[PDB]
């Protein structure tokens, strides 16, 4: 109730501010969806921790450890070894170095299917591409061979840093295509 009255006060002062609000209870969301000037298409959003909590653990009923797989993607962390860690802890912690990033696919991806683009990102770029913004426009997760990469398609990657995913934007089918070590994929390949 206190946070809804802050949203109302912000939106009363100026309607077009993007407001992002943390809500503790799901039934309280309806009250702010009904504010006249709240608009999810303008980017307003309510991070409902009750909805999200139960959603993450419910996916663990479908895939037993998935709440941990997925919650680690949404906090920024860098992998940092220490010699007392067992093998399983180092494997785990390297996995926690991952986050999910959005970046534009380079023109070298144009007219590939999503499966070719995902094979290419994984094998050459060391990037796990898992979804794309299909141009209104809509998110598609792991789309089948029927979906081509259109020009300037935004892709969704799992990677260790934003410095990694840039490689999808800089990759070039003539200039970089023979590179052995991914650190050399750089500088737009002009």
Partner 1 sequence: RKFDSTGMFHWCPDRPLNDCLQDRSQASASGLRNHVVVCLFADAASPLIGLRNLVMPLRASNFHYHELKPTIIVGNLDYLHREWKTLQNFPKLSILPGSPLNRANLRAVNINLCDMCVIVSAKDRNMEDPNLVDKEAILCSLNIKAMTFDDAGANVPLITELANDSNVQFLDQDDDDDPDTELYMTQPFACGTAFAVSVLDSLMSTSYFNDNALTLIRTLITGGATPELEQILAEGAGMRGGYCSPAVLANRDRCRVAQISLFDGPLAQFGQGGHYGELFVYALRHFGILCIGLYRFRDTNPSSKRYVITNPPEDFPLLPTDQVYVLTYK
Residues 23-62 close enough to bind partner 1 by CB under 8 A: 29-31, 33-37, 40, 43, 45, 47, 49, 51-53, 55-62
Q: Applying CB under 8 A, does 107 fall inside the site for partner 1? A: no
Give 123-166 as a 3 state SS string.
Answer: HHHCCEEEEEEECCCEEEECCCCCCECCCCCEEEEEECCHHHHH
Site for partner 1 in 118-177 (CB under 8 A): 118-119, 122-123, 126, 128, 130-131, 133, 139, 141-142, 144-145, 154, 156, 158-159
Q: How many residues bind partner 1 (CB under 8 A)?
A: 81
Q: Applying CB under 8 A, does 179 fall inside the site for partner 1? A: no
Q: Applying CB under 8 A, does 3 fall inside the site for partner 1? A: no
Site for Ca ion in 156-175 (CB under 5 A): 160
Q: How many residues bind Ca ion (CB under 5 A)?
A: 4
Q: Rounded to the nearest whole angstrom, what is the least distance from the CB of residue 190 to partner 1 in the complex?
A: 27
Among Ca ion, partner 1, none, the one that 190 touches (CB under a kind-dependent 5 to 8 A) is none
d(CA 111, CA 98): 28
CB 153 within 8 A of CB 105: yes
The Cα-based distances of 78 to 97, 125, 139, 160 in angstroms read 5, 19, 27, 7
Among Ca ion, partner 1, none, the one that 151 touches (CB under a kind-dependent 5 to 8 A) is none
134 contacts: CB under 8 Å, gap ≥ 6: 140, 143, 147, 150, 153
Q: Applying CB under 8 A, does 64 fall inside the site for partner 1? A: yes
d(CA 184, CA 4): 50
d(CA 92, CA 89): 5
Written as six digits, the tokens of 160 are 């260790």
Site for partner 1 in 68-97 (CB under 8 A): 68-77, 88-89, 91-96
**Residue numbers at the binding site for Ca ion (CB under 5 A):** 12, 97, 99, 160
The binding site consists of 12, 77, 97, 99, 160
């Amino acid at each position: 109730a206190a946070n809804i009255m802050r949203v109302i006060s912000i939106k009363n002062y100026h309607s077009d501010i993007k407001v992002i609000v943390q809500l503790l209870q799901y039934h309280n969301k309806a009250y702010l969806l009904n504010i006249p000037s709240w608009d999810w298409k303008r980017g307003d959003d309510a991070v409902c921790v009750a909805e999200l909590k139960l959603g993450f653990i419910a996916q663990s009923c479908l895939a037993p450890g998935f709440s941990t797989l997925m919650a680690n993607l949404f906090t920024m962390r860098s992998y940092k070894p220490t010699p007392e860690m067992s093998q399983w802890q180092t494997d785990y912690m390297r996995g926690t170095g991952m986050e999910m990033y959005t970046e534009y696919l380079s023109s070298a991806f144009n007219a590939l299917t999503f499966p070719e683009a995902a094979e290419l990102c994984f094998s050459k770029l060391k990037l796990l591409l898992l979804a794309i913004e299909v141009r209104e426009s809509t998110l598609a997760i792991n789309p089948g061979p029927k979906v081509k990469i259109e020009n300037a398609t935004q892709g969704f990657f799992i990677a260790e840093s934003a410095e990694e995913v840039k490689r999808a934007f800089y990759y070039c089918k003539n200039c970089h295509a023979n590179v052995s070590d991914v650190r050399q994929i750089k500088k737009c390949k002009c």
